[PDB]
């Protein structure tokens, strides 16, 4: 198995650490789902007059 | 009809003289002014209401 040549492990670990904990997460953090527009046509409490 | 009928001495004339010489007490308002002033004050209040609105 080449998976066990434990002199090439750092060069496989560290760029994964980057691309999984930094770059992909930044790529997500720029993906935002705005809440749907809820145009409530009913927002009117002014009052009656003093009478 | 009341002089040629009554047999009393001038009672028609003095009774109806008291009538034609009677002041009946004219009632007085004493109430329109207060409600007029109330109306003016309310006009003020709702004038400013409509200004705000």
Curated annotation (Swiss-Prot), chain A:
<dbReference type="GO" id="GO:0015078">
    <property type="term" value="F:proton transmembrane transporter activity"/>
</dbReference>
<dbReference type="GO" id="GO:0015986">
    <property type="term" value="P:proton motive force-driven ATP synthesis"/>
</dbReference>
<protein>
    <recommendedName>
        <fullName>ATP synthase F(0) complex subunit 8</fullName>
    </recommendedName>
</protein>
<comment type="function">
    <text>Subunit 8, of the mitochondrial membrane ATP synthase complex (F(1)F(0) ATP synthase or Complex V) that produces ATP from ADP in the presence of a proton gradient across the membrane which is generated by electron transport complexes of the respiratory chain. ATP synthase complex consist of a soluble F(1) head domain - the catalytic core - and a membrane F(1) domain - the membrane proton channel. These two domains are linked by a central stalk rotating inside the F(1) region and a stationary peripheral stalk.</text>
</comment>
<keyword id="KW-0138">CF(0)</keyword>
<keyword id="KW-1133">Transmembrane helix</keyword>
<dbReference type="GO" id="GO:0042776">
    <property type="term" value="P:proton motive force-driven mitochondrial ATP synthesis"/>
</dbReference>
<keyword id="KW-0496">Mitochondrion</keyword>
<keyword id="KW-0225">Disease variant</keyword>
<keyword id="KW-0375">Hydrogen ion transport</keyword>
<keyword id="KW-0007">Acetylation</keyword>
<keyword id="KW-0122">Cardiomyopathy</keyword>
<keyword id="KW-0813">Transport</keyword>
<keyword id="KW-0406">Ion transport</keyword>
<comment type="similarity">
    <text>Belongs to the ATPase protein 8 family.</text>
</comment>
<dbReference type="GO" id="GO:0005743">
    <property type="term" value="C:mitochondrial inner membrane"/>
</dbReference>
<dbReference type="GO" id="GO:0045259">
    <property type="term" value="C:proton-transporting ATP synthase complex"/>
</dbReference>
<dbReference type="GO" id="GO:0005739">
    <property type="term" value="C:mitochondrion"/>
</dbReference>
<keyword id="KW-1274">Primary mitochondrial disease</keyword>
<keyword id="KW-0066">ATP synthesis</keyword>
<keyword id="KW-0812">Transmembrane</keyword>
<feature type="transmembrane region" description="Helical">
    <location>
        <begin position="8"/>
        <end position="21"/>
    </location>
</feature>
Curated annotation (Swiss-Prot), chain B:
<feature type="modified residue" description="N6-acetyllysine; alternate">
    <location>
        <position position="40"/>
    </location>
</feature>
<comment type="function">
    <text>Subunit d, of the mitochondrial membrane ATP synthase complex (F(1)F(0) ATP synthase or Complex V) that produces ATP from ADP in the presence of a proton gradient across the membrane which is generated by electron transport complexes of the respiratory chain. ATP synthase complex consist of a soluble F(1) head domain - the catalytic core - and a membrane F(1) domain - the membrane proton channel. These two domains are linked by a central stalk rotating inside the F(1) region and a stationary peripheral stalk.</text>
</comment>
<comment type="similarity">
    <text>Belongs to the ATPase d subunit family.</text>
</comment>
<feature type="modified residue" description="N6-succinyllysine; alternate">
    <location>
        <position position="23"/>
    </location>
</feature>
<feature type="modified residue" description="N6-acetyllysine; alternate">
    <location>
        <position position="30"/>
    </location>
</feature>
<feature type="modified residue" description="N6-acetyllysine">
    <location>
        <position position="17"/>
    </location>
</feature>
<protein>
    <recommendedName>
        <fullName>ATP synthase peripheral stalk subunit d, mitochondrial</fullName>
    </recommendedName>
</protein>
<feature type="modified residue" description="N6-succinyllysine; alternate">
    <location>
        <position position="40"/>
    </location>
</feature>
<feature type="modified residue" description="N6-acetyllysine; alternate">
    <location>
        <position position="23"/>
    </location>
</feature>
<feature type="modified residue" description="N6-succinyllysine; alternate">
    <location>
        <position position="30"/>
    </location>
</feature>
<feature type="modified residue" description="N6-acetyllysine">
    <location>
        <position position="8"/>
    </location>
</feature>
<comment type="subunit">
    <text>Component of the ATP synthase complex composed at least of ATP5F1A/subunit alpha, ATP5F1B/subunit beta, ATP5MC1/subunit c (homooctomer), MT-ATP6/subunit a, MT-ATP8/subunit 8, ATP5ME/subunit e, ATP5MF/subunit f, ATP5MG/subunit g, ATP5MK/subunit k, ATP5MJ/subunit j, ATP5F1C/subunit gamma, ATP5F1D/subunit delta, ATP5F1E/subunit epsilon, ATP5PF/subunit F6, ATP5PB/subunit b, ATP5PD/subunit d, ATP5PO/subunit OSCP.</text>
</comment>
């Amino acid at each position: 198995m080449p998976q066990l040549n434990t002199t090439v492990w750092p060069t496989m670990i560290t760029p994964m650490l980057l691309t999984l904990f930094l770059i992909t997460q930044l790529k997500m953090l720029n993906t935002n789902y705005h809440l749907p527009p809820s145009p409530k046509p009913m927002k009117m409490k002014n009052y009656n007059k003093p009478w | 009809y009341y002089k040629a009928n009554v047999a009393k001495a001038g009672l028609v004339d003095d009774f109806e003289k008291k009538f034609n010489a009677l002041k009946v007490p004219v009632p007085e308002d004493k109430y329109t002014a207060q409600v007029d002033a109330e109306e003016k004050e309310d006009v003020k209040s709702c004038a400013e209401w409509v200004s705000l609105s």
